[PDB]
Amino acid sequence: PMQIVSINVGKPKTIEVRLVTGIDKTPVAHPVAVGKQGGEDKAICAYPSEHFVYWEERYGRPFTAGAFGENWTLLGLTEDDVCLGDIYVAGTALVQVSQPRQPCSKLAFKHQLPDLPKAICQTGKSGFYFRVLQEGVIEPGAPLVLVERGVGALSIAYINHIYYHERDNAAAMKQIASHPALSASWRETFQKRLA
């Protein structure tokens, strides 16, 4: 009971500065190609559907698939159970956990909830990104099968906790920064801190 319950797709837009993808993504009912492409590290944004229950209770309104701008709405995989470096088979694709997802102002504007990013940081209900190790195709309801536990078994919950609360924990940061699966940007941040 670990799966992608929804694959959500958004519309591209250009800004004057480049092409960016919108935070508004709609659930689709058909197969979707999973391609490799900073951009690579954040290829797929994933969010645990379990947390929608909490958000509906906190804010008194619905939260359904796509509500956090996620490509993949997940079932059975929360931040406590998913580790940096975990490799999963999804459809014909292979994906690897690269970093926690940080809360952002686009999400606050989407829901018109200015305290939502703070709440995400306080609760740790953030979701996480995957990089794509092997391109393929997935369908809604696809199982996500763990094929390798990230070395060190460092959970996304643990990594968020160090990043947001233990900014003066040297041993913790060096260790996470040392992980070969960590996104370059998170590595850099842990190396700017630590100096």
Author numbering: 0 to 16, 20 to 39, 53 to 210
Question: Which lines from the publication concern this structure?
Answer:
MOSC proteins play a key role in the Moco-dependent reduction of N-hydroxylated mutagens or prodrugs as a final electron transfer enzyme in the nitrogen-reducing system. To provide insights into the catalytic mechanism of MOSC enzymes, we report two crystal structures of YiiM, one from Gram-positive Geobacillus stearothermophilus (gsYiiM) and the other from Gram-negative E. coli (ecYiiM). Based on the comparative analyses of structural and biophysical data, we present the common and distinct features of YiiM enzymes and propose the putative catalytic site that is located at a reactive invariant cysteine residue. Sequences corresponding to the β-barrel and N-α-bundle modules of YiiM are conserved in MOSC family members, suggesting that the two modules form the canonical structure of the MOSC domain.
The crystal structure of gsYiiM was determined by molecular replacement and refined to 2.00 Å resolution. The gsYiiM structure consists of ten β-strands and six α-helices and folds into a triangular shape that can be divided into three distinct structural modules, namely, a β-barrel, an N-terminal α-helix bundle (N-α-bundle), and a C-terminal α-helix bundle (C-α-bundle). gsYiiM possesses a cavity in the middle of its triangular architecture. The gsYiiM cavity holds an invariant cysteine residue (C119 in gsYiiM), which is absolutely conserved in the entire MOSC family. Unexpectedly, in the Fo-Fc electron density map of gsYiiM, the sulfur atom of C119 exhibited an atypical triangular shape rather than a regular spherical shape that was observed for those of the other three cysteine residues (C60, C98, and C136) of gsYiiM. Considering the unusual shape and size of the electron density, the C119 sulfur atom is highly likely to have been oxidized to a sulfonic acid. Thus, the C119 residue was built in the gsYiiM structure as a cysteine sulfonic acid with good refinement statistics. The positive electrostatic potentials that surround the C119 residue would lower the pKa value of the sulfhydryl group at C119, and the deprotonated sulfur could readily make a nucleophilic attack on Moco for cofactor conjugation or on a substrate for the nitrogen-reducing process. Additionally, gsYiiM was observed as a monomer in the asymmetric unit without any suggestive oligomerization partner. In contrast, the α5-α6 loop of gsYiiM protrudes and makes significant steric clashes with the α5ʹ-α6ʹ loop in the dimeric organization, providing an explanation why gsYiiM prefers a monomeric form although the dimerization interface residues of ecYiiM are largely conserved in gsYiiM.
